[PDB]
DNA polymerase beta-like protein (African swine fever virus), 354 residues
Amino acid sequence: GGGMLTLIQGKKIVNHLRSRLAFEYNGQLIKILSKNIVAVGSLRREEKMLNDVDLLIIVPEKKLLKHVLPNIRIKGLSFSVKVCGERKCVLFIEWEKKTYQLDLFTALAEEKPYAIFHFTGPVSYLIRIRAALKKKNYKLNQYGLFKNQTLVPLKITTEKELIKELGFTYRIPKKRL
Amino acid sequence: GGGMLTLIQGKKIVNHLRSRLAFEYNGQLIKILSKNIVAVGSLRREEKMLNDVDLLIIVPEKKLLKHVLPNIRIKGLSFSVKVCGERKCVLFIEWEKKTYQLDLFTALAEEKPYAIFHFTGPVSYLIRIRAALKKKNYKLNQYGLFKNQTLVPLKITTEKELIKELGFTYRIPKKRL
DNA sequence: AGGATCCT
DNA sequence: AGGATCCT
Ligand SMILES: [Mn+2]
Ligand SMILES: [Mn+2]
């Protein structure tokens, strides 16, 4: 649906969106803070050409998940909604007379490092990491580390801390595969 | 994405499409036969208003699944593709200056009665039927009846024959729930 | 209930 | 590998 973007064009779009995201809640437009917007996906991995732009939005309250992506607003930018729910929302945005795919995802604060790790990818890397943890009866996803469907609380805050606690070598996003 | 259709408008669209569906295969446009096109979903259940139109296409060869929906063609009608693969293809068609959702699905000959049953719905009915079979260690889907992930070949040809063999009362599509 | 396509 | 949204 969306056209190809260069990495620089993608970064320009992310920079534009950082101050312009909001959601409608009880008849009020609530602005989303730049600090709670994280560029993820292939843009974070510095791929030269992008099929879409991926943003992770950190939502401060569980009760707001109902309202954020389903009532997403982008100041001054026209867009259509391809698919949308509380956790994923795919938009086709109009930018400089062309149409591009913007993927929006949400995470709660407690999920943040797991979500950054997940949404950064790439898929081949996630599969190898998850297969290794699966052998030790763990399940890793964008929400947490689980054993036997029960959350395994880890004493970590950042993505780096998570990767170290999971027992893997840290790699900059561009070198993950 | 698509507008609401009346049942009669839906039927008009199905009638139009019956002679106009084809797919591109090795540089040739292969016409799909009307006899292999079955109206399913809420249109088959005679719902007064439709959110979309559902067609089941019966594909004569397994090897053609690669080619049919991914290269679907509709003579004289403009459309865009929302999502598409070998088994489901959702199109937004232009009809009399309005946009409507056309859902296309494929089944092989051996799957036909199971596919008709599945795609006719409604969801509430499928769930109750499938839950009852699940208690007897069976799994029913659009492809067949399974026990322990193994196909259970049934001596049936039609949807009516299938429903009787599965041990349920036959109901016209409009009365299934 | 069960599966398809699409997201990383 | 694992999950979201959408299809019946
Ligand atoms: Mn991406
Ligand atoms: Mn339908």
